[PDB]
Amino acid sequence: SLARCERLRGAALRDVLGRAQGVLFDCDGVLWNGERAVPGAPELLERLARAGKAALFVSNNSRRARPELALRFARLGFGGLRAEQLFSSALCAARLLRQRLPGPPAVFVLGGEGLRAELRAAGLRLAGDPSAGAPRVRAVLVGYDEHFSFAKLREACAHLRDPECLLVATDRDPWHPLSDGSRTPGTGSLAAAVETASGRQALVVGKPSPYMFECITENFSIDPARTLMVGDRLETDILFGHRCGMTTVLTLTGVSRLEEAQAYLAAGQHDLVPHYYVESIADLTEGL
Amino acid sequence: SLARCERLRGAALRDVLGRAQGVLFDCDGVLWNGERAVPGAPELLERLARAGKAALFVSNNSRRARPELALRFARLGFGGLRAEQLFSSALCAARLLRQRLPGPPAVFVLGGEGLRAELRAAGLRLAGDPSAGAPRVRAVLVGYDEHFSFAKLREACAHLRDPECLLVATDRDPWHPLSDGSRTPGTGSLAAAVETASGRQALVVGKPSPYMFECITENFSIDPARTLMVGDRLETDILFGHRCGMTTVLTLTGVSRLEEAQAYLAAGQHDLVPHYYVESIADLTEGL
Numbered sequence: 001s002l003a004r005c006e007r008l009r010g011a012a013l014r015d016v017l018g019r020a021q022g023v024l025f026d027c028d029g030v031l032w033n034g035e036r037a038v039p040g041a042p043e044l045l046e047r048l049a050r051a052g053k054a055a056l057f058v059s060n061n062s063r064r065a066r067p068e069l070a071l072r073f074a075r076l077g078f079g080g081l082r083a084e085q086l087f088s089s090a091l092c093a094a095r096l097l098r099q100r101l102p103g104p105p106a107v108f109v110l111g112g113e114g115l116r117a118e119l120r121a122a123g124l125r126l127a128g129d130p131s132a133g134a135p136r137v138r139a140v141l142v143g144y145d146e147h148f149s150f151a152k153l154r155e156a157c158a159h160l161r162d163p164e165c166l167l168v169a170t171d172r173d174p175w176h177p178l179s180d181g182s183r184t185p186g187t188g189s190l191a192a193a194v195e196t197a198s199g200r201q202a203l204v205v206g207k208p209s210p211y212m213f214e215c216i217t218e219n220f221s222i223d224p225a226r227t228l229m230v231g232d233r234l235e236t237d238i239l240f241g242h243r244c245g246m247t248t249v250l251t252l253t254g255v256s257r258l259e260e261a262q263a264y265l266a267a268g269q270h271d272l273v274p275h276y277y278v279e280s281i282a283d284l285t286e287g288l
Numbered sequence: 289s290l291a292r293c294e295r296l297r298g299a300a301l302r303d304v305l306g307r308a309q310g311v312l313f314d315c316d317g318v319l320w321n322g323e324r325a326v327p328g329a330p331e332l333l334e335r336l337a338r339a340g341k342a343a344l345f346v347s348n349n350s351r352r353a354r355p356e357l358a359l360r361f362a363r364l365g366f367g368g369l370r371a372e373q374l375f376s377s378a379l380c381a382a383r384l385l386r387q388r389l390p391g392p393p394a395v396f397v398l399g400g401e402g403l404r405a406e407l408r409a410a411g412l413r414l415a416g417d418p419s420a421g422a423p424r425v426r427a428v429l430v431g432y433d434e435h436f437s438f439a440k441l442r443e444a445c446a447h448l449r450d451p452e453c454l455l456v457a458t459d460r461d462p463w464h465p466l467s468d469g470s471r472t473p474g475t476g477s478l479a480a481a482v483e484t485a486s487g488r489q490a491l492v493v494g495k496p497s498p499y500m501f502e503c504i505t506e507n508f509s510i511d512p513a514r515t516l517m518v519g520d521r522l523e524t525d526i527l528f529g530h531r532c533g534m535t536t537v538l539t540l541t542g543v544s545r546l547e548e549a550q551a552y553l554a555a556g557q558h559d560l561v562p563h564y565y566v567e568s569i570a571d572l573t574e575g576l
């Protein structure tokens with residue numbers, strides 16, 4: 001495996017960025033942390049566009065439907081983006097369900113309103129939507145649900161008794177660091193509860209699952225051999241890149257540490273090793 | 289390993305029961321299923337007592353403090369028992385916490401009122417008990433919590449940031465079958481959520497953890513070489529027996545199936561294989 005966790009700089013950086021036809025960016029810990037843009041991140045993106053390089057964005061965040069996601073970008077300084085460049089676990093979960101729901105021509109959702117709006121915009125019928133003056137549930141979708149409860153968990157497991165009812169999770173991120181240094185439970189903790197209580201394994205929509213890449217490649221010809229994958233999370237973004245055959249760059253502004261990446265290297269766990277790293281994605285700009 | 293999953297009957301049954309000085313019974317799926325006693329179970333216990341054999345009871349149920357547990361037994365036909373014969377994950381979690389709480393001379397609890405009463409009766413201070421006109425949390429205890437919520441999960445994880453704060457679970461049972469054929473999420477699903485979101489591994493109080501046996505042996509001299517362990521759950525009661533060096537008997541009135549036990553045998557997973565099985569514990573009576 002080519003993954004040696006080398007600091008990317010100099011002529012190698014110019015070489016790597018030169019040959020790349022495109023860049024896939026993970027979002028949180030990469031472009032920004034909370035309400036603060038990573039300094040130099042907007043400029044990197046302006047300069048990518050100008051250098052004729054394709055930029056796409058992949059987030060496991062299931063809380064915003066695409067229109068609200070588009071607004072977060074521009075607001076944090078990332079101007080002139082098309083909404084078609086933005087891929088989240090919410091959008092892709094909606095598409096996956098449209099593609100795989102069984103039965104002849106409803107989804108029980110653990111998640112918020114952004115997630116639900118996204119699902120409705122894809123044409124899906126949700127349990128808890130009004131009746132026709134009581135539709136069979138054919139998928140349980142686990143997303144980020146701040147109103148997760150034991151009753152909703154028991155309800156999910158009830159639907160799951162039917163072995164033809166699908167189980168899908170938006171993502172398995174276990175938690176996410178917040179501004180003040182605290183963490184919030186991720187969808188991966190809710191997924192774990194649903195899986196344990198039901199005895200089922202969930203289908204994962206988001207990184208590090210190939211499906212996300214499948215979802216991105218339906219609208220864009222992107223050559224994985226010529227695309228960089230940039231993220232802050234070893235078990236999510238880096239594993240994802242390796243699985244899609246992309247060159248992976250870990251940035252150190254987010255969840256994972258350089259020492260963790262090196263430890264994985266030492267242990268020969270190569271799919272969890274980035275090909276390159278940078279302190280922040282501001283460092284990629286000089287290679288253009 | 290001596291675990292061959294043999295049907296226990298005849299002269300072997302008389303031999304096995306003859307040499308045994310005592311019997312440890314798991315409760316649900318063994319003595320009863322819901323509100324219905326297993327026919328012949330009360331008689332088995334009357335006859336054990338009369339044959340001078342010690343009977344003890346081990347349940348992972350964390351919902352009843354001991355006095356309410358004692359009442360469930362008698363009511364379902366199991367008369368003349370001492371409360372000292374009854375061990376649950378609630379009682380033992382209380383003892384474990386009294387023994388291991390750090391700091392110089394409070395517990396955040398996910399669980400119901402039975403569990404809390406048990407903890408208070410052991411002298412423990414609970415978060416959410418009134419202040420002294422705001423005590424440091426030194427353990428998070430995960431029990432069966434029908435009011436589990438995302439907010440309580442985030443709260444648990446907050447306490448768990450402190451690496452000296454303990455994480456304890458009553459048990460990992462994933463779910464439990466109900467009367468009407470439905471299942472209810474178990475503590476194991478809530479534990480899984482807390483562990484995933486915190487990144488911590490919990491200390492498990494109940495079967496199949498040795499601690500339960502440790503807890504039972506503090507008041508009783510029981511020779512594990514001469515004690516039968518009887519239960520309905522391979523990964524809980526049978527594994528538990530093997531770990532405590534007891535002779536294990538699987539009864540088929542509960543969660544696990546004979547075919548699952550045989551499959552484990554076939555795969556050489558010996559700690560998940562009962563030494564013996566019976567259709568119901570009523571079949572043990574004739575060996576006395």
Ligand SMILES: Cc1ncc(COP(=O)(O)O)c(C=O)c1O
Pocket residue numbers: 026027028029058059060061062063144173176186187
């Ligand atoms: C609910 C949720 N999911 C996922 C993420 C992170 O997604 P990503 O880092 O892939 O952009 C966040 C980060 O805040 C989040 O809040």
Ligand SMILES: Cc1ncc(COP(=O)(O)O)c(C=O)c1O
Pocket residue numbers: 314315316317346347348349350351432461464474475
């Ligand atoms: C919450 C809970 N825990 C555990 C159990 C079962 O415990 P055991 O089979 O060890 O007696 C039950 C069974 O109903 C239960 O409801």
Ligand SMILES: [Ca+2]
Pocket residue numbers: 026027028029030231232233254
């Ligand atoms: Ca990220």
Ligand SMILES: [Ca+2]
Pocket residue numbers: 314315316317318519520521542
């Ligand atoms: Ca049982």
